[PDB]
Design a protein around this nucleic acid. Structure first.
Lengths: 545, 545
DNA sequence: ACAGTTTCCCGTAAATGC
DNA sequence: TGCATTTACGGGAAACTG
């Protein structure tokens, strides 16, 4: 918080200097109409006077001018810290937030700094108008209020222009309301929501800024990239900024209804075959203009690159791109990123992987799970420093299968989120376990040998448990694992409930298993007591050998 | 076929008379330029002739005229049989086809009659032009070709206008391609297909008739009915008629892409509460115009009343209305039908009910099934003549439940169509059985007492089987029936497969049941042998006590 | 105080682009 | 001769608008 606290004083300092300067100006204005009055009289009261006038006013004019020049300097130092370090830093954190990292801090802190310096410059402008008013009443050969006159004005337009343009930001990145945890992937036909905001807060600026949403503004990939598709925003291209919309006393503009549709044409005929899969990056630019007498400024800002899809089936793949993008970019951004997808270091990907789980559920991945996935992407010499090609991530088919690494994880996620949350969250699934170590850990010979592992084979995402009773011949019995369960069998029956009754060909008339010790001895039932689903002949579905 | 065959000769008769008449006309034309020539000469060959000329030509003119007047009469008799009995009958059969009755006969037979008479009138018109050409060359006080002159022309416009307007028909009623067996229920947003056709076939009429589709043309229910909603067609409002579209050498026009959307407004604000549920009837009118020199005719025809819905969930209810409509209407049709839904006789509804099944499957309802449903709609004095209010059909909740009769049957259908077709079709389900007679028929004491009955309780549509083994105390045991299976349990497991393994708490190590005689002794397996679904530990889902 | 109705969506069965 | 994208909607439930 140190740096913040220090920027806090630089801003208070600016405000002080501006007020301090306005005082000296009233004192300059009055003190002049005093000397001017005393002059007129002495002239008609005829038909140290001389020294006072022409000498102190000058010292006072010069005095003020110098002080304004000094305020503008400090304003610069302050502004630059505001714009280039604080805003720029807030933005980096936003990127990371979108892909499941720490939550963005509220923009109020930022807004305060901005408007406070925004008001000071507006003030210097007035003080500048006042000074000119004095020269019209009185001037002279080396009148400072005339030389520094022009320089100071212009210099106050810059600081102010810069500051206001930088204050226009995309508070909440584009996103589909049905996908709160997958923000930069917009699907055609559906209407996304974006939130803009001017960190400046200027009363006389409410209901004046008209915002217009544009698509792919200044995007060379349009021409340069082959097959590249074009889209049109559709819903409400424009929306005026208020302070009413957001309960938070702040100037903003939230779009809903915004919607993309293809510009199906011959101009940019499809190529299906062009430079890149439909995971090319686009941008949403927001443009507005502060129009005032003697002032005119155009504000513009754009969202982070977006991915446009036509079917939610293309979302898991689209997400992959945005993880990869934001995981490896910051810098003004490259919409041709995937023409040359830089590799990713594993200490970094492993983390983001865990974020993914901690974003759709209540618990991420721990170290065992991560090493299992790691020797799966980098093999035995898996290492935090190891590099992982984009290709090995979302394109190559993985360990011995018919799907890439990413869609496999994406589908387990989808599998957790719709059928295992409670079990998952309360750590009863160790899903990612090398099949070796599965075996290894199971001479726990507390024959109720339970271990829920996610399937490595399915396109789809399934769960299996592994069995260990005795071999009847000195040999732990053969390490038993049922065919995985996909959404199907699970949607017709909870997973716990199928665990309770896995009876599997059991000669009896009361109790039958292999059930009864969850990991090392958490008692089958005590383990899964919460999760169970506890005139006709009531029945139940059950998995059986 | 008798009546048809007779109308066939009336048409050949018309064609004969027209050709016969054209011969007599060339003979009139030449025979005149002969007599006229002989006149001119005898005049300059000076400066029984007389009798021949002025007397036979007259007998010939009168002769022809009379014969035309006689052709037009017969044309009328023929036309009227064509238009009023044959077309009108073809249309009645179409109605019945839409709701699952016998299949419509091909319109070729009809088309032949129409064009043949259509060509004859076009001919009489020419012959009429020729006759006028003769009067210009020669006329006289009681020249028949002048008195009957005008009458005959006009009379040939009528027969021809009538005939052509009647020939314009809606060959294939409106319908959604995803619902081939439910034609008059159109859902907003989706694009239906209708097929028009001109039964006239006139070469010089190809690519001339422009058809325009209109919605609710001349529909007073718009004003008269409260809450009544308005829609706009959307896709391609127009489509020119060809002979190319249909392989069948015939003039037609098929619309695809036609699409309805609400005219959401304040003009006809919603009432949700108005005179009728959203099962109000609309119409699709088709308008075109035969434009020719000296001829102009406007052709118009409309589809049978339509039902517009916004969600396929509103389809089973919409269908109910169209069954009821077409089951009880013929007549120019009443779009306010449901303001006073006439009751339905059961000998008639029972049938249509069966059609429904024989339309989504391969076997309808037999008499036992129909009496079961009958004592359910009319009770113990159920009778073919019994009347059944619309209300008891699609509104009242039925025997002791929370849904109307119709949606219950509609849901069993939906249940058959997605999960029991083979069993259903090969008569292994007796679905509709009074619970009494179920019991009654089961002291068949061939303890493999199977009986698949459709559930009378579900909102949804489910199937149960009934059990009969022995009571161990002289008393047939309590007549056992498992809770019904809805789509859920069935989508995760076929129904046969659950029958094979209903094991139900069975102390053992090889075989266990209650399975094994399907109805009277068709051997469980021999019964359901076709239907069964016949390194991990392969499993199966199974229903259990 | 919802209760019929429509809108929005998702993921599938199929169509379709080059 | 194909798949890589896109369109169609049946279907479960939120959002309408009164």
């Amino acid at each position: 918080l140190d740096k913040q606290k220090e920027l806090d004083s630089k801003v208070r300092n600016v405000k002080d200097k501006v007020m301090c300067i306005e005082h000296e100006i009233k004192s300059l204005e009055d003190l002049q109409d005093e000397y001017d009055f005393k002059c007129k009289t002495l002239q008609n009261r005829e038909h140290l006077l001389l020294k006072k006038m022409y000498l102190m006013l000058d010292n006072k004019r010069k005095e003020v001018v110098h002080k304004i020049i000094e305020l503008l300097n400090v304003t610069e130092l302050t502004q630059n810290a505001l714009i280039n370090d604080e805003l720029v830093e807030w933005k980096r954190r936003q990127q990371s937030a979108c892909i499941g990292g720490p939550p963005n801090a509220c923009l109020d802190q930022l807004q305060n700094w901005f408007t406070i310096v925004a008001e000071s410059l507006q003030q210097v402008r007035q003080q500048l108008k006042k000074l000119e008013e004095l020269e019209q009443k009185y001037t002279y050969e080396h009148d400072p209020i005339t030389k520094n006159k022009q320089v100071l004005w212009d210099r106050t337009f810059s600081l102010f222009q810069q500051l206001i343009q930088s204050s226009f930001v995309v508070e909440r990145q584009p996103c589909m309301p049905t996908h709160p945890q997958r923000p930069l992937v917009l699907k055609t036909g559906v209407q996304f929501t974006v939130k803009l905001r001017l960190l400046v807060k200027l009363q006389e600026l409410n209901y004046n800024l008209k915002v217009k949403v544009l698509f792919d503004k200044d995007v060379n990939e349009r021409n340069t990239v082959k097959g590249f598709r074009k889209f049109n925003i559709l819903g409400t291209h424009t929306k005026v900024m208020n302070m009413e919309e957001s309960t938070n006393g702040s100037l903003a503009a939230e779009f809903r209804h915004l919607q993309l549709k293809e510009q199906k044409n011959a101009g940019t005929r499809t190529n299906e075959g062009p430079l890149i899969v439909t995971e090319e990056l686009h941008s949403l630019s927001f443009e507005t203009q502060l129009c005032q007498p003697g002032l005119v400024i155009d504000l513009e800002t754009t969202s982070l690159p977006v991915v446009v899809i036509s079917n939610v089936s293309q979302l898991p793949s689209g997400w992959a791109s945005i993880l990869w993008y934001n995981m490896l970019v910051a810098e003004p951004r490259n919409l041709s990123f995937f023409l040359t997808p830089p590799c990713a270091r594993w200490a970094q990907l492993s983390e983001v992987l865990s974020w993914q789980f901690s974003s759709v559920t209540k618990r991420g991945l721990n170290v065992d799970q991560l090493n299992m996935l790691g020797e799966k992407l980098l093999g035995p010499n898996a290492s935090p420093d190891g590099l992982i090609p984009w290709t090995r991530f979302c394109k190559e088919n993985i360990n011995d299968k018919n799907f890439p690494f990413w869609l496999w994880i994406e589908s387990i996620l989808e599998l957790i989120k719709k059928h295992l949350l409670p079990l998952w969250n309360d750590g009863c699934i160790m899903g990612f376990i090398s099949k070796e170590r599965e075996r290894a850990l199971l001479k726990d010979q507390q024959p109720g040998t339970f271990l829920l592992r996610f399937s490595e084979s399915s396109r789809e995402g399934a769960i299996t448990f592994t069995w260990v009773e005795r071999s009847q011949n000195g040999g732990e019995p053969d390490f038993h694992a049922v065919e995985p369960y996909t959404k199907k069998e699970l949607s017709a029956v909870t997973f716990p409930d199928i665990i309770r009754n896995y009876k599997v060909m059991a000669a009896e008339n009361i109790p039958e298993n292999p059930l009864k010790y969850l990991y090392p001895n958490i008692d089958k039932d005590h383990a899964f007591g919460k999760y169970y689903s506890r005139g006709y002949i009531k029945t139940e579905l059950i998995s059986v050998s």
